[PDB]
Symmetry: D2
Subunit: 400 residues, 4 copies
């Protein structure tokens, strides 16, 4: 074999069998994705070599028949802590990895919520890459992380696939790796009996960048005003709820702060509410995006996601990105739906390639028979940037 994923297997081997299995169920797909997004051969090697060295050991054991890990991830259908996404727009497609870095004691008494692995991987990325910044990670780990006794209590109140506090994504963009993290607010909520809204914004308002950026303060103030009468005021875990805080692991003054809502109910009137922030936003751009999202929902179990991204130095809220949950829906149907949507958008080249490229991404499964390979679809509209489509795959479900 002389494709990059094969050459790297040959050159590098595996320290253990779980890493081997992770490679044999993910790396071909990942190489295919990078080829399909028009990454040069040299970036295909860069990213696959990076994946081998940094990501495979972070993925822990490979859950399979007869071997049941101590730690079960909610990132995927089979309990594997891995997802692969593509972000599609007019001009280009970029690849992103999503995971949870599993510590060697994760899911046991010494580490019940897998509290250490993601920071360890980030520290290793910090000596690898000059632009990686840990300050926001550490701030939120301080504010929503829990001690061992509190993690043990959280595990009594959570199903096994939700024994987590954090997760990591890595954008493979511009020849670089750009890490981002998401912290769950649910375990602190449950353990402290504090409303999720309160502990989320209490955490955000202690950021150093919040204390010296009036615009971010103003934008956050606008978001709280929208969310306060929509999310619970009490301590309950009920929808819509503020379930994740996201940061970029870069200079705090440039990092996007994200507040992620989780909810089960969605219709056209809820879309509009979320997208326009209950009529706060009315410009042409906003309204053009709304139409797009509506059209997507017509064309097409996990909660929906609504993610409000805010950047220091911007006072006004933008529309959120909306996450459609696709678990349990047929992957052939979804592919047909995505083609239709791409036609609607005028992205005729994406439309013509989507199906073929999908089958080629997952050559060991019949896509037309699966319902768990497409797991999420995010849709976004931007200023100074256009419309975007994020497609999240359960790469392992696409391989076994």
């Amino acid at each position: 074999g002389s494709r990059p994923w094969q050459i790297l297997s040959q050159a590098l081997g595996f320290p253990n069998y779980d890493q081997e299995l992770w490679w044999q169920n993910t790396a071909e797909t990942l190489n295919r994705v990078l080829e399909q997004c028009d990454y040069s051969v040299h970036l295909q090697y860069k990213y696959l070599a990076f994946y081998h060295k940094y990501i495979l050991p972070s993925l822990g054991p490979f859950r399979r028949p007869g071997v049941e890990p101590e730690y079960i991830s909610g990132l995927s259908h089979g309990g594997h802590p891995l997802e692969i996404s593509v972000k599609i727009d007019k001009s280009k497609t970029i690849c992103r990895l999503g995971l949870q870095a599993i510590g060697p004691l994760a899911g046991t008494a010494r580490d019940p919520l897998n509290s250490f692995g993601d920071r360890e991987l980030l520290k290793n990325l910090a000596t690898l890459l000059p632009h990686v910044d840990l300050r926001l990670f550490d701030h939120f780990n301080a504010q929503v992380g829990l001690d061992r006794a509190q993690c043990a209590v959280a595990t009594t109140k959570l199903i096994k696939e939700s024994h987590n506090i954090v997760c990591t994504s890595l954008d493979l963009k511009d020849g670089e790796v750009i890490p981002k993290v998401y912290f769950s607010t649910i375990p602190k909520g449950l353990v402290t009996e504090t409303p999720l809204f309160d502990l989320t914004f209490a955490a955000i308002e202690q950021m150093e960048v919040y204390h010296k950026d009036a615009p971010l303060r103003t934008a956050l103030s606008s978001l709280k005003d929208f969310l306060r009468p929509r999310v619970p005021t009490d301590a309950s875990i009920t929808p819509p709820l503020t379930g994740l805080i996201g940061v970029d692991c870069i200079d705090p003054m440039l990092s996007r702060l994200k507040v992620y809502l989780a909810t089960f109910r969605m219709d056209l009137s809820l879309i509009r509410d979320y997208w326009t922030l209950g009529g706060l936003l009315t410009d042409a751009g906003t309204m053009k995006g709304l139409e797009m999202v509506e059209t997507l929902a017509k064309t097409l179990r996990l909660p929906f996601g609504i993610n409000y991204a805010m950047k220091p130095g911007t006072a006004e809220l933008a529309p959120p990105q909306i996450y459609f949950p696709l678990l349990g829906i047929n992957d052939g149907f979804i592919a047909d739906a995505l083609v239709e949507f791409f036609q609607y958008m005028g992205w005729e080249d994406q439309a013509n390639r989507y199906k073929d490229e999908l089958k080629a991404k997952f050559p060991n499964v019949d896509i037309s028979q699966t319902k768990n390979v497409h797991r999420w679809l995010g849709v976004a509209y931007s200023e100074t940037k256009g419309p975007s489509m994020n497609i999240y795959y359960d790469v392992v479900a696409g391989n076994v």
Copy 2:
């Protein structure tokens, strides 16, 4: 003896680790013996030191092997001190170190930003009561990105290329970690006043927002400190140079603000000790007499103001006197005197022979590096205590 047994049972992953052991483990075991730790605790702490501390210490600086990272914790550049905390009843052993990352002091890690947290992570899975939330809070507020670390290394001596240090109290039968964060790099690189960036980091703590007594304590301390430390960006000691916390539940953790200064005379002892005349009670004045006597009987001076959630009132600080450059035999004789003055006759009688036995490779009458620091304190609750910091490597080479 336990240090020898563990060496036989465990060996060493590499030669630097072996040299570290050979230059410190015998001394540690002696200290632990002298302090009346049981044999099972001597094993406990020495096994712990082997597995967790040895790899954290980096290379062992020695003739012909100049490491990339040089520590200001000792005279030879070694990132280790062993200290004792003495009161009348008992003596407690403590380790002070800098956990050295494998790229420390090179362009990928100019200020050794990662090794202490790595060590602390291993402790959090070892020990049930270790809590990293205050670490992570202050690492967020005074940590720097790579480019900023690189700038700071151009404006600071080799021995000050650090942001954090770790201490481990070998108390009761537990390991109790604490950490200090240095404010200087961030202040240098941001050209922010140390006073402002210190108190900003603290005012953003979760516990500060939760606890009215802590807030009251800190406003008295800012009042006291504001006029005495610089208002602009410079490094003009006296200055707020470190922030210390305990790696415990944030609500129990002491918060420590350390001033560094190069001037101490009777006027300034009085001023630091009493918070400018704020504290006038007999307990305070008894501690002041102590400190005055100590200074009569005998690196910047240190003043450490410590506060706890729950308590609105400030207490006298701990004062640190550097001992570098002063004969170690004179120091011992002076401490015997001072111990006699306190009425700690048993500590007076054993101090000098037990010291010689800690450092059998050296002549304490001819050395000037072995006692590096002395800290002195008085609390209403616990009473008087004295902290003696040894350059264990200098006491073994």
Copy 3:
């Protein structure tokens, strides 16, 4: 207690290591206590077990986690046994294991060819008197390449996918390693007779070429064995199934040739014990009485013929009786009787209560897996001894 102290001081790198400790360390500490090892040696051996053995043991097989490699050393597939060597004066503790490589039992390492030597390498830098030359000699003569290992796995049960095993004697205050190499895989894959490949490997040893007495001993043994083991390639027990050496200076090392057989009756005990009537002295006959009595009082049977450089004459072998399937309480009562017969009254009186205390989680009256083997020997020099092999995991779950 030392096993608890070391757990507190060291923790665990991973959960499998923790489960190994939790299922074996308490028992080990008990054995070491019962054998009158000092506390400092209990620490020595337990610290060693933590650092060197735990990572060598691989995953801990348990419900829902089926490892890729399954060991024939115990009933649950765990690659560990603890054994005692009892004589009248004293009792010695020994560990038996298979060091599991991280790809063991998969296509990149089908017969676990590498983990034991890796462990042995770590011991050679730990311990001054460890010598790997006989290891390397027999690993050269009976080891296999990847493709051959893969063929052997198609012709052998899961529990026999191994070429080597390691034992560690906790003797005096030292760790003394020995290893056994299995001849079956090479014989299966090469379709060579076990007898020929066994004696070929041995005749190529450096020490064999150097030492005329060893050569004399071995020709008597080949004479004895040639007619009793197969001449063609088959696996027809009785067969020369293992070669054992000590990891010491080749000139001191015992060379052991182990027969495995499924038939033992009074005729065959006599034949194996006396080397077909070759050994007729009173010492031999006294040992035979012992073995006959043992077998009256109470997996293949084992016969281990041991030879030393320097000695021309063969000695009676050690005979191994498997105990799998027999009540552990009956076994204890039978051993008490047999100990009384030997006049080891002190061992008779304490054997059963000390056993229950080794394995407090089990009822020995209801178990059949805990005693796995019994070995018995008699030497002119050292006298009678008995080796009892426990499935420590089975005694703890």
Copy 4:
């Protein structure tokens, strides 16, 4: 930078600073060598990725001003345990790595002769590559390796750069890695007070393959007859001497057994003696090779090497390969000499490229000013194969 050596630095980083330094002083050169030998981009990645993972940690500390390792190698001028060679013939050029795998206690009381590192690396290569075989390694480690007390004595009788028992080469051929090892006989000789000839052949005659291969026995018998009256009969370490035994780490029945002589004296009458084995070989091929070697020596401190390679199933001895030592001779001169020799051989393409490619291999040093970059030149003639030129470089001396 988008060359493979740069991309891999970017993707992989370094676990420690010595590995970083090894990379910054070797990897560019190694990439250049692979490019120059017409290795595809995919093999350039395969080998550089292999080098990063397996070789960099094996190389120990990077000896440099202010940092003096405990273990000093004789493989190179600066004490670095690394060499890079090219084997040149009519049709092709292949790259080879030579090293000593340094253990973490090498050169101290627990490991005075660096006795463990090379086997550890080989075991890791054995799970990486299906064709790697450890049986011959283990045989010779058994026969010429020493216990710790014996290694400590050896170190009292050897200069610091000769505190070794073994070294490893890795041929980067046909898209694979083919390991070979060389065991020194000197430490066992010194410690046991045994003649080097005796302990060399005693070791060889105990090989399992020797016991079942009459041809190898016959060929060895012919070599002993040649060497017996030429090398010492006593225990002295004097020339010519049998100083290394070499094996290939492959199926024993296919591995070439090598006996390496070290000597300081060489002239045309000694060349002929070694090459023809004192007149044992007289065929046309032999005599044509002799002429080549003579011509090379005319065109042009370490000992010369003479390496007799024997394969199971061949009864007759072939001519040895002859190693010319080049340390201390000007590297510009050597380059001019090699061009002349290549012209003589009719290898006009090699002749025209040699100088330019050399400067391009070592872009941070002026080659015309150095005398330690070319360290050895081996010359060989074969049956079923032709003439060969092996050029060994002190890559670190070419970089600092």
